[PDB]
Amino acid sequence: MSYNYVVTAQKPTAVNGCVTGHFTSAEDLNLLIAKNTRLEIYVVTAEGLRPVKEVGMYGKIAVMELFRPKGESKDLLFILTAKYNACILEYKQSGESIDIITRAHGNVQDRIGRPSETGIIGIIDPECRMIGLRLYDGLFKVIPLDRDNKELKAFNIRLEELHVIDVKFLYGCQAPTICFVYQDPQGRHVKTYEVSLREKEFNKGPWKQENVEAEASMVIAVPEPFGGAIIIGQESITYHNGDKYLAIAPPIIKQSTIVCHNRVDPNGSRYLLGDMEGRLFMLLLEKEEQMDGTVTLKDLRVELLGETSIAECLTYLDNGVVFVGSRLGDSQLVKLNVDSNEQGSYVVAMETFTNLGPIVDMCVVDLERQGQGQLVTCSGAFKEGSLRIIRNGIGIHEHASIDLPGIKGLWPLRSDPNRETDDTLVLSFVGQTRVLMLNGEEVEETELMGFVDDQQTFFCGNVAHQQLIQITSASVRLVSQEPKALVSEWKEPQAKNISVASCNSSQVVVAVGRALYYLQIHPQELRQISHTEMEHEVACLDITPLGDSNGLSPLCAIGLWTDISARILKLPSFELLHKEMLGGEIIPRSILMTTFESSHYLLCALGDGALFYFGLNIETGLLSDRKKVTLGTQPTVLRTFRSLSTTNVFACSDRPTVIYSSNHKLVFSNVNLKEVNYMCPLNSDGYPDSLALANNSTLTIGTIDEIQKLHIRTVPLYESPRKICYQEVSQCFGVLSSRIEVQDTSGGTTALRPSASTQALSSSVSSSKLFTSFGEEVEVHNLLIIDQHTFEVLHAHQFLQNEYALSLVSCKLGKDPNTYFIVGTAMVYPEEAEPKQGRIVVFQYSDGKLQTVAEKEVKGAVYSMVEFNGKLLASINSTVRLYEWTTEKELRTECNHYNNIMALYLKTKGDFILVGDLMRSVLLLAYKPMEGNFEEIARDFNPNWMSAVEILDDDNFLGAENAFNLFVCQKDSAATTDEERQHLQEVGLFHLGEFVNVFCHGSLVMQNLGETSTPTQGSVLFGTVNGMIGLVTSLSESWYNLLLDMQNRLNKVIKSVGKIEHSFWRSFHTERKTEPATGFIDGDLIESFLDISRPKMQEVVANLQYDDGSGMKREATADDLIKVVEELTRIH
Amino acid sequence: KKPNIINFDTSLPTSHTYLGADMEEFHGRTLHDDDSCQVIPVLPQVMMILIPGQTLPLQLFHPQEVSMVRNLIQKDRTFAVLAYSNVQEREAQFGTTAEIYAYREEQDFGIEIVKVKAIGRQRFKVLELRTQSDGIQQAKVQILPECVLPSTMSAVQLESLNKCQIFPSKPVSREDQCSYKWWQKYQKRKFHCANLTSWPRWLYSLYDAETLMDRIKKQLREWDENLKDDSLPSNPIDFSYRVAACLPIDDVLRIQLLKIGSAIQRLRCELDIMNKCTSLCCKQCQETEITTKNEIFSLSLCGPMAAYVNPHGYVHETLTVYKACNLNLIGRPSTEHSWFPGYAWTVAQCKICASHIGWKFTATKKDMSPQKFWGLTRSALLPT
């Protein structure tokens, strides 16, 4: 009884693994990046990374490795999913079609077994003889690697050592030999085994157990010719080969522990290391020893290269380039230039890839356009803390507004020879063509000499030979720049009226009724060069010069009124070089030819609002590539505005859009405007690189932003931001933050780097009196005020010592007109486990200064706060308390309600406090105002880890819980039994695959009522640790049933990578119990329906029983689904 | 407050040499399938909440119970003990199944008395309390499952820092500056990925298994000088059950701890109870302090509390104290059936209401805790 619809508004960005190898081809060098469920395949070139393929797998990539067995030309990819769905993939492309085929696949989980504490380890034999997986304690799983093992069957080999830290395969061994470090009561040890496939058991290792450091963490296998393994702890790096042994204690690595590594030389002479706080090291192996051809180590020098982002996965690309794959920061692409050394750093950054995770807090704010929200996150951690502002859509910054009664055409002109800039814009109404002049802020209607006065101009622009043209409804009149005299005027021989006009730099082709005349603009002349007629009236014409030449279009495209067909014909003739019969009924309204990214297209817009993009051949002929995109429900006018050193096409309609090319495909962003009827690029002197947009009410001039669907501005703080709230009246942001300060031997706390708290305009330190070892790191909490326009730190309030600030709310209380920042803290001491004292402090930002209006001292930790109807509701430990803002600016207790749970989460909707804890103990309350106390309505207790919770509506509540799941609970208020009334039934399950930290009501698209509204009700955004912003909406029962049927039918048509069943992937998963998903419709699977081929589209729908408004219409068509699916795509 | 010399050889208390010596023993364990309904016979005349892992002594006299237990030993060996609520007369909805490990039948007194000892194994909730005309009603039993949760960091863990999640063992044992400093780096290194989530590390330490177990061990040693690993299990399930058994709480709190399905919630509840508890006063008076919480030691490996049977079959749970107050004794110190091998129990009563709170266990030898051992029971001891 929930019927909800979940979709991804921004794909995950945090990198949890990256490999290199010859995957796509034996010649190319590929960098494969797994970000979560998405696998990105790049190609390493001199300029950088060139994306090639984007595949999204049905699972979280836990292990991926590239291996090449015998008899293969390029490396294969082995991927293991967190649900233990193993597979082996192979790249296969034929010209334009790219397919990642599944060589093998099979689930490798066990019926019984506790997953290991150190997690999944997946290793592949260097000779590609088997695959070793350590999924479960006390069991080594081995997958034999033979061509006949297409189901990936594996056998378990018993390990007597239950605590295994790191295991890898050794290089240069006749039989597959593993090496690992394990934990014992006597300490940590290194051991090796000789795995035998025939006997299906272990054997005696080449070199026996050796005692290692008490904190030995990783094993790295040195390749031939050195051999053996290198074991890196917190204080030492040791090399083991049996008889040969080395040990070093470099002091440059004692500060932090190494977590990641990657070989940089095929011969393993040098290694690359990274630690927790983000500095690159450089382990070096010296092969100077050579007695009788044998190569042995002699030293283990460690060199510090520099500081990079906090890395999770290092990888060395070709020619001194390192890809630092960060997960709590931003990915980098750095240079290992050993000669630069500007100040003592060996690394310089080249690129920086956006990474929004971890998203700890979000808020939706109408920053620029009223009605359209913007997401301001609290991303990153440690030195990578930053605020991200995500905006959906290209936006136009208005700079002028001249009211006009429905301009029917805007066209720029230059009435100033040798000016190199626009001078005036020639508008054209229904009956007259006014010529407005605009140099600076001028709006004068300065009529040109050669332009007609009372006519609806069809074209007006700068023509060749320093002349201006004006293709009016009467005749094509040519004018002059300097003398401004009518050089020529080609009237219709039969005194007919021109229907459609199209002009180029040197040519002008006009259509009078069903006849087409081609006229060349010779210097001070206009002589017809051709004349022909078509079957029906010309709906539209387009003669745009393609690449090069730019003086004579080889082809001209037209549209037929009574045929609904588009043809391309040679300009100096009438020979139909190609034809097409796209659709029917509604006639074409505009034709345009573009050159997006050196590839030529041909865009035709029908009168119903659908643009049918197609490919065109410049030399001769054309392709078909029929891809109809429904960009609005009004006739579309297509114009080309460069504005980027690129082509770009602005499709004016009820939903204005910019059609650009991202890499080699045409993307379709949407412009944040209500409706633009006509547009024209005005590069006027006073308006640099502006664009005149004419709605049905007025003409506006402004500048477009950057052609990109989602834009993420970054404001680095260099400290971890915890919570964020927005205060409208002050135009400021209230953000909590923490910085790490080391305890020096002077009684103070010195910092580690310049942060946003130590670099504010004005500063403060909390001064309240209501109540170690050299090297210890202590957290210092601040409340920063950040401007919403400049995003500069206006103030930085520092809290007391040992005080942890937990929550934050910006609301006005009681009858007071002032709005405040309410901050709830907790005084935490290392000696004690659970705090005894906290503090509710009310700030007030005015005149650029932060003042503490009021201060309340409570007994506990204030885990959350909400503004329940002019009354702060606080959750002090396990007590939910409601406060009243007195007339003297002092908080007063009104009612208490004691729980047996820690009220970590408080979400209110009217008078219904939703209370939860970290044990998934969702509790529902109601606040009776006539009596003034809280009352418990429902309860749903189930032992499980719950990450967040949100009130979808008065009945359904949504939350995220363990193993990356989602759920919905619903209270049946109509139950006649009290036991069911007091119970919260669970009506939805879903394995999202992501860890949600925050829910927030809002939407990133324009809020239009639309009279008929939309099939989706409500909108809730969530942000995850990996950096994925989703969106969950409700559905009606009929729509839920239709989408469920379509989702079942898509699963038999769409072939996934690895052949993981969608029902299995979305099944609610947990270490103790997994059930199928219910009540959730996957927006990704549904939205993938638009990308399948037409025969597959026909296969998907054959009995859907589409119509619900009377009848069934059992045929159900296939474009009817397109109408439904696009409506769902528009909600995000 | 007798320190140092605690000479008892404190395991004898948990062997019950009073309920007979050469008692026949039973091999090992059994198992009931999770979430299954079972037919488990109910032995009557027992009114006590049997925590799993807790030993339950029993003497059986009436022929119906003797026959039931005989057929029980010859078919399985498990019966049901129901957690009776405040209302008596079969007002129970939860319970635990007892499973036999020692058995002895005596033909003495012209009767077929059967002396038996059992320990709780599983936890269940009764569907319907079917009654049989024989006298031994069989209950409709649903096996309530036991929940174990992974680390709260396992979902939000970073893969890299996972090898750094297998800690070296605790330094030495039970030493200051080896706990307050070890635990700090333990919390800092275990919950380093709490920065990705929205909550600080100490919050995730409040829901930890090992940290809660450490804090509870601290308080229990603060009372009775425990022997580090004096049979305190490493498993949070078993540790929680042991602590719940040994806590000096009333019946409602025991039932509430029995209702809880997860180890972490049980440990948090025990911490709350043991932190908010101070005095133990006489039920029939709710007016007299017959203890405190500091004056409480353990001569049994099972804690300050264990189940013992008087020769009439009634089961008593006794609380061990150094020095009880407001108790008057009657009768010479006698030693016929003492559950503690070497003392001579003297019956104690409230100084006002005169109710059987417990006994004073005076010594016999001289290398003993000299006449300082009050084994107060729970029939009159309301935590106040």
Ligand SMILES: N#Cc1ccc(N2CCN(Cc3ccc(COc4cccc5c4CN([C@H]4CCC(=O)NC4=O)C5=O)cc3)CC2)c(F)c1
């Ligand atoms: N149907 C039937 C049927 C058949 C046979 C029955 N037989 C009757 C005769 N019984 C022998 C006998 C009787 C009396 C004693 C004295 O012991 C008593 C008496 C009363 C209360 C308590 C104790 C000991 N005690 C505590 C003190 C603290 C401690 O440490 N341990 C304890 O046990 C008490 O609380 C010893 C042996 C054997 C059984 C029968 F009773 C029913």
Ligand SMILES: [Zn+2]
């Ligand atoms: Zn009394």
